[PDB]
Design a protein around this nucleic acid. Sequence first.
RNA 1: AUUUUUC
Length: 105
Amino acid sequence: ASNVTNKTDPRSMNSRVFIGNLNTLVVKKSDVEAIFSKYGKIVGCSVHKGFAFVQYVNERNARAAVAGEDGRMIAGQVLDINLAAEPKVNRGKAGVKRSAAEMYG
RNA sequence: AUUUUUC
């Protein structure tokens, strides 16, 4: 698949997958487009430090991997997968941080 | 080598 995943169209912002807390020191672009291609047609993919991105053809494909791979282990670590326009995590760089509305009370 | 963008 292509190397592009940063569009901002009203259907490309929800046909995309965010992949945080990723084992980016063992994974590669040829791995991310091979771990998420089982849940949809990838037409763009990119990888960075601590996170990566995947661009599907539609939103249905994104919900397939955002609910099909989220919380899975790869290369010995777990990755936090979510819709690219529906962030809920505090981006605490470890997943240990909580929201002021989701605290222990 | 470590959570929203071109590895």
